[PDB]
Amino acid sequence: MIQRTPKIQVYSRHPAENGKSNFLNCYVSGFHPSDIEVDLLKNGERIEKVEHSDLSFSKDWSFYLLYYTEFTPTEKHEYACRVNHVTLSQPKIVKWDRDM
């Protein structure tokens, strides 16, 4: 058996086709087993509509998840990713660093 803690990155991207739109992304990488819970948060509250969740694996024991949705960020709110996994004793909350 193998278990590996997810690496978690939170970042924003504008699709080059439409620069006015903005996507909030949570890239959860290199984890095993594949069982996982991932949410995007706004002010600590779960964002219900996340239009994209893309799961893949490399080797049989390494999973990759890109979880993202359109948003219009303001300075008034805090955005984050919350991840639960068997390797994590408590939920991991990673705040969006707005430089990325």
Author numbering: 0 to 99
From the paper:
A recent case of systemic amyloidosis involves the highly unstable D76N mutation of beta-2 microglobulin (β2m). Indeed, the 76 position is located in a solvent exposed loop between β-strands E and F. A detailed analysis of the interaction energies of the ensembles reveals that D76 is at the center of a network of stabilizing electrostatic interactions that are lost in the D76N mutant.
To strengthen this hypothesis, four mutations were inserted at position 76: D76A, D76E, D76H, and D76K. While D76K resulted too unstable to be purified, the other three variants were structurally and biophysically characterized. The crystal structures of D76A, D76E, and D76H were determined to high resolution. Analogously to the structure of D76N2, these structures do not show any major conformational change compared to wt β2m. However, although the backbone of the EF loop is well superimposable between the structures of wt β2m and the mutants, changing the residue in position 76 alters the H-bond network within the loop, in particular in D76A and D76E. The last three C-terminal residues (residues 97–99) are the only stretch undergoing some rearrangement upon mutation at position 76. The side chain of Arg97 presents different conformations, and the strength of its interactions with the EF loop and to Trp95 varies in different mutants; residue Met99 interacts with Ser11 or with Arg12. Such observations suggest a role for residue 76 in determining the interactions within the EF loop and with β2m C-terminal region. Similarly to the D76N mutant, all three mutants display a decreased stability and increased aggregation propensity, confirming the key role played by position 76 in determining β2m biophysical properties. A saturation site mutagenesis (D76 to E, H, and A) allowed us to show here how position 76 is indeed crucial in the β2m fold, any mutation at this position results in a notable decrease in thermal stability and a remarkable increase in aggregation propensity as observed for D76N.
